[PDB]
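Thread: Modeling a multi-component assembly for a lab meeting

Hi all, long-time lurker, first post. My supervisor asked me to bring a structural picture of a complex we are working on to next week's group meeting, and I have zero experience with this. I have the sequence lines for every component (448 residues in total). Could someone generate the structure of the whole assembly? Inputs are pasted exactly as I received them:
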Amino acid sequence: QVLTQTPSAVSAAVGGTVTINCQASQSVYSDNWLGWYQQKPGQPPKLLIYAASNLASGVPSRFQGSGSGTQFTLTISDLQCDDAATYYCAGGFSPNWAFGGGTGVVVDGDPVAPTVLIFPPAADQVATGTVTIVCVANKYFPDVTVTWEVDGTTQTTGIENSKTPQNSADCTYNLSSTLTLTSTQYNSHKEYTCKVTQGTTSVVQSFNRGDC
Amino acid sequence: RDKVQKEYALFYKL
Amino acid sequence: QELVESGGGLVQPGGSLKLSCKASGIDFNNCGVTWVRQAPGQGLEWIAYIYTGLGVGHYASSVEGRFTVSSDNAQNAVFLQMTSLTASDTATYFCARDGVMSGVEGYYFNLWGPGTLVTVSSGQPKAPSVFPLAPCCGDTPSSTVTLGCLVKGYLPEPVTVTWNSGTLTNGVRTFPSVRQSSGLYSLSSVVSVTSSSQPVTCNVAHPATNTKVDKTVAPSTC
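Re: Modeling a multi-component assembly
Sure thing. I ran the full set together rather than chain by chain. Output:
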């Protein structure tokens, strides 16, 4: 069996409405064997709708299930930040189940400007011949962009970012940017800057090698 | 096995 | 009312590995126990099923003949024996229990476990190198302050980070790991605390290499 899900990702604002279509390659055993699971990063899935259209115990009324046979639809109303996650349709076909490909739901909330923290390498990092500078963007929404500057020179390599899931309460993000380079290069400079731009607004946080 | 239990058994084939 | 799966870890291509799913609050008497794996950054995949009632097991085509679901009721727990493994089998394996609810809702996976991560590859394990994350010694502080720890250069992911042996959890931000070019992973974890006379330490654990590191993060680089 195959439950083709559409769309694969959707971006909706707080209070809006999102629709997820689940097309099955063949009729399920019966409408009593089609459910929707909500999964957030690092957590196990959670039953949301059972019997194709029955609200699971403890699920808010914002979620509605509809369909039958092979075409099913999930509808999320009054979209909240707590609904930020990935949704899967699972259909039973007698002996086995089948999960859809999943649909990531991103929730647009109130914009928030981020705060930036820069962390110089620990005292015992240069000893290993490798230095990793860490920069964090705290509590923010509309995705940001990070640029590393070493003595006014923009870095183009040795940068890798990681973003946390959206906060269940305010949709906000949290990002960490790390700049790794040779200990010989870390000592050939002094000013290390982390700039986080949110559109056309920038937040800068720097440190001088001769002070930490 | 009642109604809810037979469809379950018939489903997984018990 | 709880479930825990154990047995995950690094394994070579072709080797075997037996996973277990133990209950702690309920029993596996006359109910279905399902296994669902999820590759890193991928979707859910139904693999196997077993009914503890009369030991009826079902397996997906991807694991046809290579895996085996067991239900040794001694110390109520279900098992999953994996024979010839491959890289594609790398994923987080969950176990779910049905019948917990009443009515038709009982057909579905009501109770889930946290999941156990299995890594299939020939790479050699390597413990991480925890480094402190504190503001430069020449920065303006205040009533609070953000400290963290850097965990880089480690193979088989499953790394658990905590603060103060799990007592300091409010305001903890552990970012997702990132597989670097050299194949080694690395992550960071920062925490916001009110400055005082309390020991702020990060407890880094790497079950793959059986290592536990505790790095007392100083409030400054001095």
